[PDB]
């Protein structure tokens, strides 16, 4: 047992109810009552029928919004050691006292 949804209006369908329609181009449509299929075979647009589920979501009735953009931008973490130099090598070299650097310029 399972339930289906009306193609035209979105109402819930329980076993034994509604109909099943197969068109010439091998497309399958399901209906829940006589109101849906009578409107479908009349070439009506479901987006202009006020009580359909598809119409309601287009006009955003009963639904709210959420924003989480700037929260993700904060994702930053630490660093690791390159194959050439282990982690102890990099920070020792960056933290060399300026006196050694002054000696390097004069020596060179």
């Amino acid at each position: 047992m399972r339930t289906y949804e009306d193609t035209f209006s979105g109402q819930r369908i329980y076993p034994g109810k509604g109909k099943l329609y197969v068109r010439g181009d091998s497309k399958i449509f399901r209906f829940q009552n006589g109101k849906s299929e009578s409107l479908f075979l009349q070439r009506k647009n479901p987006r202009r029928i006020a009580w359909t589920v598809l119409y309601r979501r287009q006009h955003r009735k009963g639904i709210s919004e959420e924003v989480a953009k700037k929260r993700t931008r904060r994702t930053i973490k630490s660093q690791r050691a390159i194959v050439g130099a282990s982690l102890e090598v990099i920070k020792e070299r960056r933290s060399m006292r300026p006196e050694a650097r002054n000696a390097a310029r004069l020596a060179a």
Binding site: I82, V83, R101, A104
Partner: protein, 180 residues
């Protein structure tokens, strides 16, 4: 249904097999790039939050970000798109890709760790891998070591060692030929 877990911080990756569906129930109906809690996976996953990055369909098609559907759709992929590699200038080919809404149909998920938990993972967060290459441009070398305007950027470049096959000679050193 397999899981592809990656750790960007430690540079480690792992693949796990999950066969029990109620643990994967909380993953359904989520979107690619969303935030999820890893608690239902197991006791060892407490305190973990994961990011959904991508997946593959049962037939093998991948998910494409920006298309909202649980099924798969045909698209006219031009140059610069994700899952297309053109063979000729200006070529456009029609292909089929699977939507960005997670569902039971997919075969593999890909996800990464955002925040570490109290417990450790036996084969994922207990090991680290080193980087491959150091910086090569002149200005990037100076910023990396926080050198001043005139600090002889030549001397501070990273150089590794390599040895010949069986010559018995000493190994030598390799350097990246600073540019700019």
């Amino acid at each position: 249904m397999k899981l592809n877990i990656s750790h960007p911080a430690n540079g480690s990756q792992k693949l796990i097999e999950v066969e029990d569906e109620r643990k994967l129930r909380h993953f359904y109906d989520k979107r690619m790039g969303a935030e999820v809690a890893g608690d239902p996976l197991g006791p060892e996953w407490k305190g973990y939050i994961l990011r959904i990055t991508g997946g593959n369909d049962k037939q093998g098609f991948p998910m494409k970000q920006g298309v909202i559907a649980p099924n798969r759709v045909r698209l006219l992929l031009s140059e610069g798109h994700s899952c297309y590699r053109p063979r000729r200038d200006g070529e456009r080919k029609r292909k089929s890709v699977r939507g960005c809404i997670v569902g039971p149909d997919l075969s593999v998920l890909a996800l990464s760790i955002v925040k570490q938990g109290e417990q450790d993972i036996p084969g994922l967060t207990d090991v680290v891998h080193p980087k491959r290459l150091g910086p090569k441009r002149a200005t990037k070398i100076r910023r990396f070591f926080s050198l001043s305007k005139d600090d002889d950027v030549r001397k501070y470049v990273i150089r590794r060692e390599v040895q010949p096959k069986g010559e018995g000679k000493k190994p030598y050193t390799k350097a990246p030929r600073i540019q700019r």
